[model samples]
Target: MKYVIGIDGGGSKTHMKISTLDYKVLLEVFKGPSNINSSTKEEVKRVLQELIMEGLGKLGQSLEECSAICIGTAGADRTEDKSIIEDMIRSLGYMGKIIVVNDAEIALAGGIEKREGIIVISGTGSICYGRNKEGRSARSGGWGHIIGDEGSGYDIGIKAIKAALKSFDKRGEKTILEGDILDFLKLKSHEDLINYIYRSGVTKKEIASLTRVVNSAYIKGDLVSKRILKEAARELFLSVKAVVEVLSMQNKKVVLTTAGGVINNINYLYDEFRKFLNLNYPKVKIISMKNDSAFGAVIIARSECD
Candidate 1:
């Protein structure tokens, strides 16, 4: 009758799952973002509280019956951030063991159904994280949109915008992306596009949505769009190479799993990523995630009992 809770908190949304100690899921709840980096502590706390209460309420189970709760979220790598999340959960009156880790860790666990592999995530942001059999781990390319996130949706979106502007000015080759970007943003001119990007308070997710425009142009054989996607794929591949070298997993037969929107939704980007890896590192096998990260959190929560 023991229960556990697993949470996956990200920039866009948060997912919660209630499961038995044996890892059978019982109740599921979806809520707003709880990433402390992008949201206020008070807001994240409110979301966490609501998710837990709503989930346990539907399951007709008390928090005391839960053995552990594992939360995998972005911006939780530091001890301070982890402690803040722990306090949020503690305020919910659950006295069980609590585990907190970065979102990529849980994705890795769920992607391969084990922790001993690399996960390249290319959502609004991008990061490559991996853990080896000896309990060693390494990561690369998670510096966020300002400095890193080289292969992320945000990166692609920004490049697409740049391409569109360059084409408008005749500084770059003509590209269908010019028209696509303009249409997608509902802007009539490049001048308006500039205002939209700078003055309209466009969010990262909004910018990232432009990746779809890039994809559409690529489908039309726009060389500029193709170049951008190829470069993005190369960036992601280099990130994976960096992690593999740090972990010394280059020659070994290892799994390389992918997550996030850019890699999963954009078939061209995914193919290019595979091509780069296949040429450089022949032994690494790429696979799709076997389970969502919330379920991965459940797996971690279940392990906490041991």
Candidate 2:
């Protein structure tokens, strides 16, 4: 009756799953944010502790029955960060194997249902990560919104706002995005937009929400929105290209998948992304995730225990 714990410690929320050695899910629980970069160690520790204790309690199991725990999270790629997470788990008195990896790694594992493929994530942020058969991995993008995240929801949102502003100022071609974006944001004028965006309380997620407006505008035949989506797909494709080339997966029949809200929810961007990949790298077969990233963490934990 041994169990394995898998955690997807995302920026906004955390998902934890406990499963049997044979992968039968015993319990699934949700918690608060656990991204080490944005959240304090104490906060993450509190969230994890509550999730683990509550989940095990409901299942009437103890930590000793767990064979391993794997946590996939952001800001944990470094040895220092991994050690921090390990310590947090160790403090909970579990003496089994502990694994910590970047969030994208779990997405890749879950997306392809294996550890050896590419995953392009374009949520509030973006990153491209892949592991080859040899267990070697490479990544591109994910530099954050200040510099990178070119194909992410935040990127699309910012582009939409800029285009809308340009249209308002007569500097860019006329488009419906101007009114659409303004209406979406509940702002009456360009001055309100400026104040809203520049406000300290405006988070990246809020800005990224504007992507829906852009997508809607694109559906309504707005060329600006269409171009933005196409460019985003191209940028995301470049990231996949970089990872594929670095991993030497080119010419090889490899599985490539996508995660995150931007690329998955927006059909136009995804279509363009597929078009680019099909035209440039026909061998890279794009597929949807077979399971969620938390399940991917369970797979990794099981592998470690085995």
Candidate 3:
């Protein structure tokens, strides 16, 4: 029995699914934070290998039997970053071909397959991507926290954090987010948010846990949350529009899709993005992803052997 593996290594969590070439569900696993950009290559290798080996071990098999493998992750944006993971995958005893690409690529592929379309993703991080018929592709706002990442959960979290501090400084209008933000940290005071950020050795999981604060605030009509999402939508729409125009994609119908927690959990963000894009690209059509982007890794891998 031949088998293959697909990995979606998220910043806060890693998920995997294994299957035989002919369609057999062997195992599925979800592990801790493992994106190589925010994590060490050595550490990511260990975690991914563990997940893959554990999944294959359950079926009385090992990595050698895998006909192919693919991993989509945030940090594997460039070939150098991807090489670190590709080398690691090769050392895992898999005889088959393995490819690594940025998580966003798989997401767009999973959302629309080979069809031309644009995707704006917002999970722990955020970015927009699209390919035109001319094989032209463009990306926007995926620079990570502190610089870019204008449209993601991390972006929203950072915005909410700044809002809290502004409340502390009394330099801005107060918002209703303090309760949920403070509650998320299990702290009696807002100062705890400050101390927590300054704390050394805090993992991505710890930071990502604050996404709920943004979610809670958005639900409760927090000014910061609303503002962050609106900007996020604008940036994403711009990304898609630039890609379509650059490649001269002609059609009254434009395809769009979104994935990740910020888009999934905050439906309003997606709605707002759709509304804005439609206003300019009147032909734009928004569609929800049917499955997680990790499934796209499987498609890429299987295509290799096909």
Q: Give the TM-score of candidate 1.
A: 0.96
lDDT of each: 0.89, 0.88, 0.74
- What tens digits encode model 3's per-residue C-alpha lDDT throughout 89-186? 77876667888888888888778776467878777777887777666787766777768766677666777777777876788678766566777777
Per-residue lDDT tens digits of candidate 1, residues 204-236? Answer: 888999999888888989999999999999999
lDDT of 1 at 210: 93
Estimate, for each residue in 1-306, the C-alpha lDDT of model 2 and write its tens digit.
899999998754699989999899988999866566766788878888899999999999899999999999876788999999999999999898999998898888778878688999888888999988778999999887897889898999999989988898999999898899889888898888888988647877888899899889988999999999899999999999999899888888778999888899888899999999999889988999999899999998998876
Task: Give candidate 1 regions above 4 Å deviation.
Answer: none
- The TM-score obtained by model 3 is 0.91
Against the true structure, candidate 2 reaches a TM-score of 0.94
Candidate 1 clashes between residue pairs 3 or more apart in a chain or in different chains: none
Give me the overall lDDT of model 3.
0.74
Clashes of each: 0, 0, 0
Angstrom error of the Cα, residue 258, model 1: value is 0.3
- Tell me which of candidates 1 and 2 scores higher on TM-score: 1
Evaluate candidate 2 by giving its C-alpha RMSD to the native, one decimal: 1.7
